[PDB]
């Protein structure tokens, strides 16, 4: 059926659970375990907490919520934070903080499914 | 069926209830009890109560609502709070407070299902 | 069927009513009576009434609405209030008040189903 | 069927009407008459009319709308008011007023079904 | 069927119309005529027109819309007004005005169904 | 069927039209013609145009829209206005104006169905 | 069927068209042509353009949109305007303008169906 | 079927197209071509561009969008503009401008169906 | 079927495509190609960019989005702009600009279907 | 079926893919490849970034999002930008910028389907 | 079936996964792997972080969220950032930043499906 409506078989579910019980690495692990079409992730919220200028340096902090969903319908959502310090230009700091926040949120949300992740 | 619409069997329900009657640890317990696809959790609301600057120290407090849902449809929601004191940088304090709030909310919401959690 | 659509049997309903006629304790009682998947609770509204600073002390009051729902569809909603006085730090006072409000609301809403609760 | 969609039988309806023709007490009466799963109640609106400080005393007034619904679908909604005077602390006055308002609204809404209530 | 979808029988409709052709009293009359599950009422809107302080007295006026609905689906809505004068305390005046407004609205809306009401 | 979905019979429609071709009086006429469950009325909008204080007198004007609907689905909506002059107290003037506006709107909307009304 | 879903017969449609090809008068004509349950009208928008005070006289102008709908589903909407000049009191001017606007809108919208109207 | 869902026959469509290929006049033409129940028109938006006072004269301009729809479902929408100059009173200018705008919009939208209109 | 749900036949589609491969003129072409009931157009957005007063002259610019839809469901949307310069009166400039914008948008959107348009 | 719900055949899909693998020109190419009824395009968002006046010259920049959709349901969305410099009049600059933005967005969005575009 | 509802076959899924395990280049790779109708992409959010003027130079930073969806229903969303520095004109900087942000977001979102991308 369509994504979010299919169901696993007994053997497939058992194998997946056994493997589970035991950021490119985590993405590769997820693709190998669930399959390229077996999982999805999205961003539900993001905002900038503060942007401060020190003596020629920028300090930035970003928050982001990441939602991970499976083919069956189960989901997990967690928060991620990104920080950049000691940089000279605003753009690089903001870019790094925003990307790191999303990556950390994805990692934390994907850890909830098992110890392997 | 799809998540949120399936139903347990008599034997499975009895076994789950017997086991129930009796934050990585609680996550592992939940995955072992309900299964990797048997439970879900989400964040419904979050806000910053206050950010104050003392004599070189930051005090922060964060609130968060966490909703836990099962395969059948039952759900439980509870509040969690995170606090950071004595830190030097704003970003670390905010990150720690936000993550701790979500973790505490998840723990409290997952305790409502039984004594084992 | 799915949660919120199932119906009780005559014998089960009679037994539940007889037991009913007669905050970890109330949670345990509810789980024993209705079952781990037989009841649910949620938070519909919450706000801070006031935060005042006395001579080195914080006074806080919080309101919260708690909704309790059963497997059949019946529901009960009630208000709860939490107060903290004599504390030194804002964060602890707020946390205690917020949690106590939710707990009191849950207790009051769960009392409406019978004398046992 | 699900709550809000079932229908009474002729004998059950006749018995209920005969009994009807004739705040823990009213709750017990309702549970005995309709059953623990035969009625529900909720809060639709609530607000604080005024908070005034006299010579060391607090005067408070609260309004609340309470909606009572039955298994069949019939419903009744009424207003309730709570007042607190002569108290010393704001939190206790607010708590008492809010709870009393909800209780009075529930009583008034539950009186509309018959003389027994 | 569910409330708001059932239909009367010819004899029942004829008897009800004959009886109709001819605030606890009106409530009792309605319950006797339509039945405890044969009618419903609700509040759609309410507001405070003005609150004025005279030489130690409070003058208050409240408006309210009341909607009455039957089992078949027919409905009638009317306005009600409540006034309090000569009182000393704000809370009692507001409570009396608000309750009287709802009661008057219910009476006026219930009069539209026939002369008996 | 439910209200707003039923249909008339040929003889009933012919009789109703013949009678039609030819504020308690108009309400009684409508109830006698269409039946206690054959018509409905509601308020869609209402506002206060102005409140002015003359030399000890209040002048008030109110607008209201009234919608009348039948069992089949046909409907008619019209405006009504209420005015009060020469009164001493604000509350009585407002009450009279508001009620008169609704009554006039109902009359005008009910006149559109025929000459008898 | 329900209003807005029925369909005419060939003979009835032909007769209606022949009669069509050829404010109480227009209302009577419409009721005679389409039937008391064959047409409907409503108000979609209304506002006050201006209220000016001359040397003891009030000038008022009101706009209104009127929508006319038939049993089949066809509809026509048109604008109407009402003006009052030379009056002494605000309330009468406003009432007359508002009613005249609705009447003119109804007339203009009902003229679009044929020359007879 | 209901309006907006019926379909033409081959002969009727051919005749209508042949006639088409070739503001009371345009309304009469449309009623003769499509039928009294074969077309509809409505107003989707209207606003006042400007109102300026010259040396004792009013200049007004109004915009309006008119949507024309047929029985099958096809539709056409176009803009219309109305202007009044040299008038003495505001009300007459506004009325004339508003009505002329709607009429012009209807004409322009009805021209899109063919050369005959 | 209803508009927006029908489908072409193979021969009709082939003929239409062959003819396509090759503002009253474009309207006539569209009506001849698709048919009077084979195409539709609408306005989705419109606004005034600026209105400036030079030495006795008005400069105006208007934007408009035009959406063209066919019987099958295919659609095309494009922007149109209208400009008026050297005029003496505001109303004529605005009218001309607004109408020209819609016409240009219609032309551009209708050109996307083929070279013939 | 209706647009956005049909499906290609194996041979047609293979031919289209082979042709794909390899602003009037791109429009002609798209119409020849997918067909006059095989593709659609729309505008989802547009805004003006800035309008600055230099020494007698206007500088303008416009952004636009363009969404391209096919008969099956696949879609692609991309951003386009338009710039005008050295012009004398505001209207021409704005018109050119807005049209160029939409054209560039359409081109970029249509390039994503293959190398031929 | 329609896009977002179809399902892969076992052999096709296996081949796609094997190929996956291993910005025109990435677009070509995606079209070759999934097919011209096998994938889609869209923009969910975009904003300008800051626009600063240095000594004759413009510094710009843009954020964008890109959502990639497949035929089955699986999806992945990621953030992209674009920066422009050292440019002389605002328009070129903004255009380059906005386009680069979307391209980077597309690349990052498309990398999540496998190592080949």
Author numbering:
A (entry chain G), B (entry chain H), C (entry chain I), D (entry chain J), E (entry chain K), F (entry chain A), ...: 24 to 45, 68 to 162
Task: Provide the publication's sentences verbatim.
Central to these functions, RAD52 promotes the annealing of complementary single-stranded DNA (ssDNA)8,9 and provides an alternative to BRCA2/RAD51-dependent homologous recombination repair. Instead, cryo-electron microscopy and biochemical analyses revealed that ssDNA annealing is driven by RAD52 open rings in association with replication protein-A (RPA). Our studies provide structural snapshots throughout the annealing process and define the molecular mechanism of ssDNA annealing by the RAD52–RPA complex.
When visualized using cryo-EM, we found that the two species of full-length RAD52 represent open (RAD52-OR, peak 1) and closed (RAD52-CR, peak 2) ring forms. The 11-subunit closed rings exhibit features similar to the RAD52 NTD, whereas the RAD52 open rings have one or more subunits missing. The closed ring comprised 11 subunits as observed previously.
